[PDB]
Amino acid sequence: SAWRLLLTRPAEESAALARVLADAGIFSSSLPLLETEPLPLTPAQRSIIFELLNYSAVIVVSKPAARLAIELIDEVWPQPPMQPWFSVGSATGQILLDYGLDASWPALLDHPRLKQAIAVPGSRVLIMRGNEGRELLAEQLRERGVGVDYLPLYRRYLPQHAPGTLLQRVEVERLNGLVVSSGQGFEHLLQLAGDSWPDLAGLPLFVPSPRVASLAQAAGARNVIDCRGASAAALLAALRDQPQPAVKAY
Numbered sequence: 001s002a003w004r005l006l007l008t009r010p011a012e013e014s015a016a017l018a019r020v021l022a023d024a025g026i027f028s029s030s031l032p033l034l035e036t037e038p039l040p041l042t043p044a045q046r047s048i049i050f051e052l053l054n055y056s057a058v059i060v061v062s063k064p065a066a067r068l069a070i071e072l073i074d075e076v077w078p079q080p081p082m083q084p085w086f087s088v089g090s091a092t093g094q095i096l097l098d099y100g101l102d103a104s105w106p107a108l109l110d111h112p113r114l115k116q117a118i119a120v121p122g123s124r125v126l127i128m129r130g131n132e133g134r135e136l137l138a139e140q141l142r143e144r145g146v147g148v149d150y151l152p153l154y155r156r157y158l159p160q161h162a163p164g165t166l167l168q169r170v171e172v173e174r175l176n177g178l179v180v181s182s183g184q185g186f187e188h189l190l191q192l193a194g195d196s197w198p199d200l201a202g203l204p205l206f207v208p209s210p211r212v213a214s215l216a217q218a219a220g221a222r223n224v225i226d227c228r229g230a231s232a233a234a235l236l237a238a239l240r241d242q243p244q245p246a247v248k249a250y
Contacts, residue, residue, distance in 0.1 A: 001025045002245050004174050005206075008033040008189055009181040009230075020232045026239070029173040031166065033188040034181075036064045037155050039131070041072075048126075048151060049076050055149075056123035057114060058085045059137065060103075065128045066095040068153035074099070084117040109140050118146050131155040132184075134211075158188045166192040170200065176245045179206040181230040186215050199250035206238060 005021065005028040007014040014030040021028050049072050052058065058081075060066045066087070073080060085103040087093040096103035104113045118125065124147035127138060131152050138148040166189070169175070178200065180186045186207065193200050197220070205221045207213045208230040216224050227238040 003177050003239055004028070005177040005179055006031060006170060006173075006175040007179050008185055009179075010034050010036060013181070017232055017235075021235075024236060029169060029175060031161070031169050032159050033192070034156050034185055035159050037157060038068055039152060039154050041151075041153070045151060046072075046076070048149075049073065052077075052081050052126065053083060054124070055083070055126040056120065057117040057125045058083065059108070059125055059127045060085065060087050060092055060096060061127065061129040061133060061137075063092050063095060065130070065153050066092045069128050070095070070099045072153075073101075084113060086111065086114055108137065118144075121145070123147070124149065126151055128153055156184060158191070161192060164194070164196070166194075167196040167200070170203075175203075176248060177204045177206065177239075179235065180212065181208055183212045183215055186212055186219070190219050202249055204242065204245070206235060208234075 003026050005026065007017055007028050007030045009017065009032065011030075011032045014028075014032065018028050018030055048054075052073075060069055080100040080102075082102065085096055085101045086108060087096060087103060087105045088108055090105055093103050093105040104111065108114060117123070118141075125141060126149055128151045131154065138150075141148045170178075178189070180189055190197055201220050202222050204223045204225055205216055206225045206227055207216055208227060210226060213224050213226045225238055225242060227234040
């Protein structure tokens with residue numbers, strides 16, 4: 001309740017987060033650092049869509065990917081593909097499941113369903129995601145002799161913000177906590193922070209994962225709060241878990 005959080009994720013995403021937070025007795029102000037921009041892909045990425053059967057399995061990593069994916073399938077396939085599709089979370093999984101894809105979800109790597117589609121020599125998997133992402137899954141797959149290709153369905157950028165609007169936003173709004181939802185989210189913060197970072201660095205920083213926690217520690221953040229994921233809950237659980245907000249120092 002004494003937490004005046006700053007939210008850095010996409011417009012609609014925080015707007016909702018802002019809501020569940022509001023009706024929970026916590027103020028927040030949103031300054032979007034990421035935006036999801038669809039990509040134009042028909043040159044060869046249109047043919048890859050038609051030959052999806054070339055792969056033994058299709059993995060979709062984000063909701064943005066799942067949604068842009070459905071829109072491509074529906075355009076070329078008079079019906080949904082009869083092939084194994086997977087996701088990390090049920091959130092993205094239902095999206096695919098609704099359009100009639102044979103999707104399943106939990107490590108994903110240990111999912112039996114997935115092992116079977118991979119359990120041949122020469123089998124490949126197609127991963128639909130952003131312009132860039134975590135390489136862990138692909139590297140784990142390749143290590144076990146499974147080929148992996150990518151189909152970038154979109155890109156992420158830093159909304160156009162007036163310089164210094166990060167510090168002045170934290171001041172005028174009296175924010176005593178910072179939240180990021182991705183790693184490239186923590187980047188684009190330390191950016192806008194600019195030369196102001198040496199003081200913001202002392203504020204509680206709520207990161208989605210250890211991976212992100214480590215990018216922040218490297219940057220000098222002194223109070224990194226690891227939440228289990230970027231869902232509203234995992235955040236509230238983290239706030240409740242955190243001592244009373246220490247009055248600003250700078």
